[PDB]
Amino acid sequence: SSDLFYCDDLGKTLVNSKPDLIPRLPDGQAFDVNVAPEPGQVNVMMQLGYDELRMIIEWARKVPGFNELQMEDRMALLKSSFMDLNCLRLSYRCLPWLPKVYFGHGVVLSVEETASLGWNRDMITLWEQYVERLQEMKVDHVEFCLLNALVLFYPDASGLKDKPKVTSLQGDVLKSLRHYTVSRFNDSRRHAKILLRLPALRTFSSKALESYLSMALDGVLKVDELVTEMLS
Ligand SMILES: [Cl-]
Ligand SMILES: [Cl-]
């Protein structure tokens, strides 16, 4: 792609790590919004949510400095960023499908249909605000890819042991982002503007029940056991 021409070495690797993959339902499973899942099975929002959790972990391992960190620092970064990463990935792929929510291949729902599947007016409001920022920022493919790595390398992550290393790793990503926006658009200010406009659901605890869909994600799949398995 023409975009990688304005990236540095780290920037090319982060674009090639593909944080833009989209979750899918199992092969041959048709989705019909009118035909309820209710009673032994889980709905498509959760199926896609769990598929995406696995994809986020798979992406994180391709991020240069991640595997060098000790297992508990990798576990801390993922736990802290899962909500922000899911929100960023979802909002970005929704942009051509607006006003609908594009949860995954074969699943595009209006905001009203999301409510019947697990979401509440509170989670709808958060997604609305997150899409609005990406639209304002006018984020391109490269910028989205780099933003995923910036969200991952969060130095204030709870239970993080090697804070200076994550700070330096975030620094390396910041350098790739300013390098890119300067080389392609020749606007020194663009990197700082997108970084200041980006919502961060960690400033105020995401446990505020406005976007506590992570409790359903952590409860059903027992995320701690799966993360250890995937990072081993
Ligand atoms: Cl995909
Ligand atoms: Cl430097």
TrEMBL record:
GO cellular component: nucleus
Domain NR LBD: 6-232
Keywords attached to this entry: DNA-binding, Metal-binding, Nucleus, Receptor, Transcription, Transcription regulation, Zinc, Zinc-finger
Subcellular location field: Nucleus
GO MF term list: nuclear receptor activity; sequence-specific DNA binding; zinc ion binding
Signal sequence coordinates: none
Main subcellular localisation: nucleus
Family under the similarity heading: Belongs to the nuclear hormone receptor family. NR1 subfamily.
Protein name from the UniProt record: Nuclear hormone receptor 7
Full protein segment contained here: 159 to 389 of 389
